[PDB]
Scaffold this active site. Structure first.
Site, PDB file in Angstrom:
ATOM      1  CE  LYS B 180      50.495  92.004  27.444  1.00 23.47           C
ATOM      2  NZ  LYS B 180      51.182  92.782  26.509  1.00 23.47           N
ATOM      3  CG  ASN B 181      59.058  93.255  26.881  1.00 23.27           C
ATOM      4  OD1 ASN B 181      59.855  92.533  26.556  1.00 23.27           O
ATOM      5  ND2 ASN B 181      59.518  94.680  27.000  1.00 23.27           N
ATOM      6  CG  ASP B 182      52.962  97.037  22.653  1.00 26.86           C
ATOM      7  OD1 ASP B 182      51.821  96.532  23.163  1.00 26.86           O
ATOM      8  OD2 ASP B 182      53.169  97.959  21.688  1.00 26.86           O
ATOM      9  CD  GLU B 183      51.310  94.517  20.240  1.00 21.76           C
ATOM     10  OE1 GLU B 183      51.008  94.339  21.642  1.00 21.76           O
ATOM     11  OE2 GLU B 183      50.752  95.468  19.584  1.00 21.76           O
ATOM     12  CG  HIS B 276      50.448  89.675  22.600  1.00 23.21           C
ATOM     13  ND1 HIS B 276      49.806  90.267  21.384  1.00 23.21           N
ATOM     14  CD2 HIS B 276      50.081  90.393  23.514  1.00 23.21           C
ATOM     15  CE1 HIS B 276      49.124  91.473  21.573  1.00 23.21           C
ATOM     16  NE2 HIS B 276      49.506  91.767  22.787  1.00 23.21           N
ATOM     17  CG  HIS B 310      46.620  88.635  25.254  1.00 25.48           C
ATOM     18  ND1 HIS B 310      46.446  90.117  25.855  1.00 25.48           N
ATOM     19  CD2 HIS B 310      47.743  88.476  25.769  1.00 25.48           C
ATOM     20  CE1 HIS B 310      47.609  90.451  26.448  1.00 25.48           C
ATOM     21  NE2 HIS B 310      48.365  89.471  26.275  1.00 25.48           N
ATOM     22  N   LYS B 318      37.081  97.703  25.431  1.00 28.78           N
ATOM     23  CA  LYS B 318      36.932  98.038  23.594  1.00 28.78           C
ATOM     24  C   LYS B 318      37.325  96.790  22.775  1.00 28.78           C
TER      25      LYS B 318
HETATM   26 MG    MG Z   1      49.927  95.978  22.931  1.00 28.56          MG
END
Ligand code: MG
Ligand code: MG
Ligand code: MG
Ligand code: MG
Ligand code: MG
Ligand code: MG
Lengths: 448, 448, 160
Positions: B180-183, B276, B310, B318
């Site tokens: 997936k793309n980063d947000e 997201h 998510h 973390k």
């Molecule tokens: Mg990210």
């Protein structure tokens, strides 16, 4: 990470003059056992890139551990661009600058206080297409410093059926300029849009014909579905027909998000866009150390293209607000203004109207205007109108007279002696009258 | 206001059985000098109606001043309805139940912990159109309990040019399922969509042909402009052509708002919708007493129609999260589940996938699965993949082997002796290995 | 939109930003895509503003899909070398409303991060109010350039 994502020797003056960065100032507190710089640097990394990549790294250029401040420089190229028209998007600004960094385990709290937008980025934001001068024009008032626009929300705020709602609108418009939907009222089964909106227009026409003055209506078109928003907007403009320019579109922009604001802004740019910030308190409250402030929210709304936005009563009413909030109004209405951390030039971008609501009345307005320095505002006073002892219309008049009083630099007690509605506001809000104007009963010849 | 907007003698059992109210449970603390009931009643008033009007009043039906809890019943008719198709909208739920009440001066703080949706309201929400079973089907795995889907984000998260990004995708897909793309990554000038997306598809095809296994890609289509979102979506599906069903649409739903989520959900229902939650921490953090919790956010997303969302790593990685967050997964994936305050029946509404991200690796997964009770999840492990000493592909394999290990109820140390990638994960994350599996070096015949 | 929007792009005062230098590429019709783009680049090394001649559009000897990407390359190259912003005014005049929108959409997509620098030229006198309003209402965020070709048939001093 400090070595790569921080350069505390950078001069802010150069970063601004360069015009290649969006600058952001935060309050920040690291988690227990976490160093301040390593926290700031980690935030910068998580808010950007996580040999070419180094050129678009976000950089911490300043920290003050004692005051809990950090400032970050975001290279312009980080921010997303429309494939359709190349414009930047506020959602990208939010994603990067206040997204994942709000959930970091090594950060106790992080809140945006201010940001600087350079010339090129400013050129690529939509900005407003309409502003208060367009309303002044309709009302037959000076397009420069046209002054106070009286308004209200119909009471009760939800629950009125179509005929009752429309009658209340007519009654207010006999004295006031501006009516708006409450933030949640739309197409509830007890007051369907197809029923009430034609009745509201009849009231507007009747009030216009009888007063000989133009009237304004701000309709809520907030909805999950883009095409629902457009359906409500299209129906509203058709219904108001030859008066359709007097219809503003209200959007619950905070809970609704940038998508809804832009739908109104881009699909109906010729209609005044009214940003209602319901929900904002969940991060903008003085007690909050997360998200962003009311100032930041308001400044963003101007970039998004809001014609006006709620800014509160600045400590002269209820809710959470203070006299220093006048800077919020200044930032959105002026062409050149200094925020808490950054000076901003707007280069001719249209001003967003500060919209005042929440506990104002004719007696409180003079102090509010004195603090603000002007009355170029829309004031949707629910209590100030319906709280008037005589009528909602009289209440609207008293509000206008309060502005005319302040504008003339006149004595409110003496002004009341020649303005009945204003005078009757003293008897409508006696507790406010006693505090603000002690001895008013004797001077105005009113009962003890 | 207490007399009208509170009835603490109402039985919750009756309110639920009636099916005429959305119930909401809050944490609440009144401002100094303000009584608890008067605060709660005031919140109920400001969150609803401010003789017919009485029938739609929100009612406080329970308070616990000692624990700082209040529960409110919202009549169903309060909530806005589409003129187009009569469906309810989540933005109306937000406006009423967590809008203006977040900025009240007599309220210190107010946060939603849980809510109950009655049958009729549930029938009028979109709900998901796709779910994890659709992905399992593509991957050739059982549509019931198909299990763990390995994934990642390409590193660095922003800054890679088109060719480098696509190559990294190919390399991972040789071992893993899901990228997936980063947000925030979309159409930045250094990696334009029109350039990178065709290259990514080439990598997907090449990986599919070489492994003989299907691959998945989740593309960010987040944008202010509805028509920009649709432009990105249309281009993506055309580019992937005969594999277009394998394209998921990622939406930054928290910062983007309900408008963007619904655009994806309603205009592209046949594409898996990936929610997201970047930014959510500004209200969902454990330290926050405002807005709403991660649980509330996740439950809302299912109603909105997210195929997956998510939910964090539940204390096994973390960020801010704990083992009790497994209830979040249960509420969105089960047909019948009990939240912190309300039991919810979903009446066959499709499940939203819990998507796991943030500090997982092959060594931590067995504990995560044991806590959750299953591995029917998508895990976009950035560190767990690229952190592997051998390769990102090997990392993906080690993650899958970790699931197969737990599913088989096998000993991880012994499982490693017959699974090289899994074994090499011990050497990839030695600090985790020492904590979780002390003595592993001796048993696996690894250097000291 | 107005001249202040152009001044802003050019980095000049939004009040009294002054003279904006421009030209039409010569010959006005007949140049193939590469020759046209080369001429645009050469002018932009010194000037701000280039516009299509009023009849220049999608002729078979210079198709829009061919020339426009080349023109944008010239604009980018000139901007990079001069460090100054450049402006291009494209003719989107057409009988069919949806033809106008097709040209406009392709133009903005082509110019990408510089799409705000594309003005839309409309032959408004010969084209009529319909075409002007199509540009104005469907693309309000793009500078609208009214070309009055044909007007002389009634505006001439000899006309009554
Ligand atoms: Mg990210
Ligand atoms: Mg309200
Ligand atoms: Mg704060
Ligand atoms: Mg809490
Ligand atoms: Mg000519
Ligand atoms: Mg003549």
């Amino acid at each position: 990470q400090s070595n790569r994502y921080a350069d505390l020797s950078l001069k802010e003056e150069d970063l601004i003059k360069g015009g290649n960065h969006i600058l952001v100032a935060y309050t920040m507190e690291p988690a227990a056992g976490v160093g301040y710089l390593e926290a700031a640097a980690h935030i910068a990394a998580e808010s950007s890139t996580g040999e070419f990549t180094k050129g678009v790294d976000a950089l911490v250029y300043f920290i003050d551990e004692a005051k809990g401040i950090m400032k970050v420089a975001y290279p312009n190229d980080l921010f997303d661009r429309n494939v359709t028209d190349g414009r930047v998007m506020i959602v990208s600004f939010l994603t990067l600058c206040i997204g994942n960094n709000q959930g970091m385990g090594d950060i106790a709290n992080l809140q945006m206080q201010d940001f600087y937008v350079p010339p090129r980025m400013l050129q690529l934001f939509d900005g407003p297409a309409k502003d208060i001068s367009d309303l002044w024009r309709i009302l037959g008032r000076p397009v420069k410093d046209g002054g106070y626009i009286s308004g209200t929300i119909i009471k009760p705020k939800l629950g009125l059926r179509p005929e009752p709602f429309a009658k209340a609108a007519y009654q207010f418009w006999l004295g006031g300029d501006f009516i708006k939907n409450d933030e949640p009222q739309g197409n509830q089964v007890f007051c369907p849009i197809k029923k009430v909106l034609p009745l509201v227009y009849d009231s507007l026409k009747r009030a216009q014909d009888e007063t000989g003055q133009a009237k304004l209506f701000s309709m809520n078109i907030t909805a999950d579905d883009h095409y629902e928003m457009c359906a409500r907007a299209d129906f509203a403009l058709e219904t108001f027909g030859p008066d359709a320019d007097k219809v503003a579109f209200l959007v619950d922009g905070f809970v609704g998000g940038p998508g809804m604001v832009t739908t109104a802004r881009r699909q109906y740019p010729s209609q005044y866009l009214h940003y209602h910030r319901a929900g904002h308190g969940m991060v903008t409250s003085p007690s909050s150390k997360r998200g962003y402030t009311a100032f930041v929210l308001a400044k963003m709304s101007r970039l998004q293209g809001a014609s006006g936005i709620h800014v509160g009563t600045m400590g002269y009413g209820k809710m959470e607000g203070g006299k220093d909030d006048r800077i919020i109004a200044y930032m959105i209405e002026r062409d050149s203004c200094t925020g808490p951390f950054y000076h901003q030039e707007w280069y001719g971008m249209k001003p967003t109207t500060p919209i005042i609501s929440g506990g104002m009345n004719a007696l409180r307005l003079p102090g509010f205007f004195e603090n603000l320095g002007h009355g170029n505002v829309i004031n949707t006073a629910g209590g100030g109108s319906y709280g008037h002892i005589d009528s909602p219309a009289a209440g609207a008049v008293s509000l206008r007279q309060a502005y005319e009083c302040w504008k003339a630099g006149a004595d409110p007690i003496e002004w009341a002696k020649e303005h009945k509605e204003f005078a009757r506001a003293f008897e409508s809000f006696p507790k406010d009258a006693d505090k603000l104007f002690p001895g008013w009963r004797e001077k105005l010849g009113v009962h003890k």
